[PDB]
């Protein structure tokens, strides 16, 4: 039943992994934990193996460990990072102290693609299509990503793409929706559509759309493009101080995006106009965007699947270290690899 493990001292720690994984080599350390590239001798795939850092050091670490494992076990979609394997060298709950995750090693991210390469329109369509397809799936599980940016988009050779998080793929601020920088505290899923808009603009032009030096500059750059809030939007702002400030602003009109994205496909410009709207209620959804004529060559309504509902009820629970550890052990033990 149980595999044979082998011991190895790497970044600065012991790696104990099943002997099916060969030729470990470090590719990234820090707040994620710690990650090695490896060859999965069973499947002939290159994989990434992540050893979680200090997984059960405190209540908060332990709950984070649980959260990450639960999320990754749920995602079963071609355009979202998934779990190939999860294991521990421990034989029982009493000795359970280390957790390793195994995912595909896609060989790069969209940062590396963006300015080593000037993208054709067909290839922009393909990249954004795959983002939106993965996002439809994530949103259907009632999950919001909140941090979509090029370094969270893994890409291989053929520019097949997966949405990532937890380090498994310069400034994050550049892709954030305005309402996050205003500390809104209720978010629509379409915060993620704003970020897609920013990413798409950049694939088209080869430049960051809103390269703010800080959150205030970032907002200034955004308003110059989309204009200052209209009355219809102002009706939905409950914060007195935010209304006051916005009202102090000298009004500016929406720019016509055709004048900004010069020479882009007219359909891409249209789609951009529908993503980069200040009012989150009026942004196109991932589902609706898939059907936009810009993606006519890739869209198939019968092959854009949705997710099973994801039980987030644990986020509201306050438990002990050993309880979060036990729940995590349960999830390791119940793991079933994909085909
Ligand atoms: C500088 C002005 C920035 C205004 C940002 C406007 C965000 C508008 O989007 C708002 O998002 C909220 C939360 O997702 C929703 O509850 C509101 O109904 C919606 O209007």
What ligand 1 atom has the least distance to the C-alpha of 229?
2
Residues 51, 116 within the same domain: no
Q: Is 218 helix (H, G, I), strand (E, B) or coil?
A: helix
Q: How many domains does the chain have?
A: 2
Contacts of 277 (CB under 8 A, 6+ apart): 226, 283
Give the pair of three-digit tokens for residue 220.
């200034």
Task: Give the distance from CA 121 to its chain's centroid.
Answer: 23
The domain in which residue 124 lies consists of 108-295
73 and 117 assigned to the same domain: no
Q: Do residues 315 and 238 both lie within one domain?
A: no
Considering only CA atoms, which residue is closest to atom 14 of ligand 1?
187
Whether ligand 1 lies within 6 angstroms of the CB of 178 is answered as: yes
Same domain, 174 and 289: yes
Measured CA to CA, the distance from residue 176 to residue 308 in angstroms comes to 27
User: Does 27 show up as a binding residue in the annotation?
Assistant: yes
- Any idea which residues carry the catalytic annotation? 165
**Ligand 1 near 281 CB (within 6 A):** yes
Residues 6 or more apart whose Cβ sits within 8 Å of residue 134: 77, 78, 79, 80, 161, 162, 163
Residue 309 CA to residue 139 CA, distance in Å, equals: 10
Q: Is 98 found in the same domain as 120? A: no
Residue 126 sits in the same domain as residue 193: yes
Provide the CB-side half-sphere exposure for 321 (13 A, CA).
9
181's enclosing H/E stretch is helix 178-181
Same structural domain for residues 286 and 266? yes
127 plus 229 within the same structural domain? yes
Residue 72 CA to ligand 1 centre (angstroms): 30
Q: Looking at the structure, do residues 101 and 155 belong to the same domain, yes or no? A: no
Instruction: Compute, in angstroms, the gap from residue 317 CA to the centroid of ligand 1.
Output: 29
* CATH number of the domain residue 29 falls in: 3.30.200.20
Is 338 part of any domain? no
Residues 65 and 179 in one domain: no
Q: Is 182 in the pocket of ligand 1 (CB under 6 A)?
A: yes
> Could you tell me if the CB of 144 is within 6 A of ligand 1?
no
- Is residue 326 within 8 A of residue 66, CB to CB? The reply is no
Q: What is the CATH number of the domain that holds 176?
A: 1.10.510.10
Residue at 305 is within a domain:
no
Indicate if 140 and 252 belong to the same structural domain.
Answer: yes
Q: How many helices (H) does the chain have, and how many strands (E)? A: 11, 10
């Amino acid at each position: 039943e149980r595999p044979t493990f082998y011991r190895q001292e790497l970044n600065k720690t012991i790696w104990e992994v099943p002997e099916r994984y060969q030729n470990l080599s470090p590719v990234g350390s820090g707040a994620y934990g710690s990650v090695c590239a490896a060859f999965d001798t069973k499947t002939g795939l290159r994989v990434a193996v992540k050893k979680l850092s200090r997984p059960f050091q405190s209540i908060i670490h332990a709950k984070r460990t649980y959260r990450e494992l639960r999320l990754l076990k749920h995602m079963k979609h071609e355009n979202v990072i998934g779990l190939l394997d999860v294991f521990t060298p421990a034989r029982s709950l009493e000795e359970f102290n280390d957790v390793y995750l195994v995912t595909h090693l896609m060989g790069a991210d969209l940062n590396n693609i963006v300015k080593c390469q000037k993208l054709t329109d067909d290839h922009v369509q393909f990249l954004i299509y795959q983002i939106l397809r993965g996002l439809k799936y994530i949103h259907s599980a009632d999950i919001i990503h909140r941090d979509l940016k090029p370094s969270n988009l893994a890409v291989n050779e053929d520019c097949e793409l997966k949405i990532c998080d937890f380090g498994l793929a310069v400034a994050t601020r550049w892709y954030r929706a305005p309402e996050i920088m205003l500390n809104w505290m209720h978010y629509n899923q379409t915060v993620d559509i704003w970020s897609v808009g920013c990413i798409m603009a950049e694939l088209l032009t080869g430049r960051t759309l809103f390269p703010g030096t800080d959150h205030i500059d970032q907002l200034k750059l955004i308003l110059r493009l989309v204009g200052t809030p209209g009355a219809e939007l102002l009706k939905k702002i409950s914060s007195e101080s935010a209304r006051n400030y916005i009202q102090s602003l000298t009004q500016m009109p929406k720019m016509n995006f055709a004048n900004v994205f010069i020479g882009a496909n007219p359909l891409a410009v249209d789609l951009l106009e529908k993503m980069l709207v200040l009012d989150s209620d009026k942004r196109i959804t991932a589902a609706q965007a898939l059907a936009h004529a810009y993606f006519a060559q890739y869209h198939d309504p019968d092959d854009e699947p949705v997710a099973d509902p994801y039980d987030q009820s644990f986020e509201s629970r306050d438990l002990l270290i050993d309880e979060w550890k036990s729940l995590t052990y349960d999830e390791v033990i119940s793991f079933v690899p994909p085909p």
